[PDB]
From Swiss-Prot:
Changing V140 to F/Y: Strongly impaired activity. Pfam families: Carb_anhydrase (PF00194). Changing N60V: Reduced activity. It comes from the Eukaryota. It comes from Homo sapiens (Human). Catalyzes the reversible hydration of carbon dioxide. Can also hydrate cyanamide to urea. Stimulates the chloride-bicarbonate exchange activity of SLC26A6. Essential for bone resorption and osteoclast differentiation. Involved in the regulation of fluid secretion into the anterior chamber of the eye. Contributes to intracellular pH regulation in the duodenal upper villous epithelium during proton-coupled peptide absorption. Residues 1-257 form the Alpha-carbonic anhydrase domain. This is Carbonic anhydrase 2. It is linked to Osteopetrosis, autosomal recessive 3: A rare genetic disease characterized by abnormally dense bone, due to defective resorption of immature bone. Osteopetrosis occurs in two forms: a severe autosomal recessive form occurring in utero, infancy, or childhood, and a benign autosomal dominant form occurring in adolescence or adulthood. Recessive osteopetrosis commonly manifests in early infancy with macrocephaly, feeding difficulties, evolving blindness and deafness, bone marrow failure, severe anemia, and hepatosplenomegaly. Its main location: cytoplasm.
Length: 258
């Protein structure tokens, strides 16, 4: 019906409404670290978030997202494999019912407990709707989460999740600094791919950081208290909101690092 992550509407069903689900550059993928080629021509990523303006936090029935003002070049991604400048629109996460699954990308088949996606769009296309119709329209920065020590910079997010438990709910979420979610290293893998939820548009340059961040069990347990459902519907925990790895097909994953 309306798509989701369950047995009857999950990733294996998505191709019926979105036939590009079986396309040539679908995401996520398994990153086979020994086959990825070091590309010495790849530039360091430029992550310029000093002037980021967060606006809202929202439960959309498939994840939660923190939205940013993308009406000016305040929080931008450039360099790396990218041509031009990409504005930060939002970040969100994918996570599991248990710590051994939850990431969308895998690394030598290893699944992480969660994956953070910072979604940016190419300013040459003017708006994100236009950008999703272009093969170089979006750049998504992907960061793996493992469970161990807490991530202090994530705690402001975790603490408001009680206020957006169900689909439709949102809250003010100003002055959040996404730099507190980044690992030390910007070493990355990159490949051409797609959105990982409907409409699965093949518009994304994926930039996946090698270094995970650590979050605590308590932090990830708060993700797992969210609900896919609307407030007055049967409670169905928002867990396992990840798409599995898709066929690599005629693509090469490049590494920024040796
Ligand atoms: C809202 C949206 C549909 C959903 C699109 C989407 C879907 C999944 C998504 O997640 S992921 N995992 O691919 O980063 C990011 C976005 C950003 C652009 C979003 C689109 C911009 C215009 C539009 O109609
Ligand atoms: Zn995502």
């Amino acid at each position: 019906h309306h798509w989701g992550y369950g047995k009857h509407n999950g990733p294996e069903h998505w191709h019926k409404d979105f036939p590009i689900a079986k396309g040539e550059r679908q995401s996520p993928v398994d990153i086979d670290t020994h086959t990825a080629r070091y590309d010495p021509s790849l530039k360091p990523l430029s992550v310029s978030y000093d002037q980021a303006t967060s606006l809202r936090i929202l439960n959309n029935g498939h994840s939660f997202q923190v939205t940013f003002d993308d009406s000016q070049d305040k929080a931008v991604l450039k360099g790396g494999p990218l041509d031009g400048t990409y504005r930060l629109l939002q970040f969100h996460f994918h996570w599991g019912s248990l710590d051994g699954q939850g990431s969308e990308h895998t690394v030598d088949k290893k699944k992480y407990a969660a994956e953070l996606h910072l979604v940016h769009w190419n300013t040459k296309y003017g708006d994100v709707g236009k950008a999703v119709q272009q093969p170089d329209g979006l750049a998504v920065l992907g960061i793996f989460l493992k469970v161990g020590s807490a991530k202090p910079g994530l705690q402001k997010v975790v603490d408001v999740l009680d206020s957006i438990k169900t689909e439709g709910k949102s809250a003010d979420f100003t002055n959040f600094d996404p730099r507190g979610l980044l690992p030390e290293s910007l070493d990355y893998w990159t490949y051409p791919g797609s959105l990982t939820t409907p409409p699965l548009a093949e518009c994304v340059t994926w930039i996946v950081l090698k270094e995970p961040i650590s979050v605590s069990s308590e932090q990830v347990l708060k993700f797992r208290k969210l609900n896919f459902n609307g407030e007055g519907e049967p409670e169905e925990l928002m867990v396992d909101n990840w798409r599995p790895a898709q066929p690599l097909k005629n693509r090469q994953i490049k590494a920024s690092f040796k």
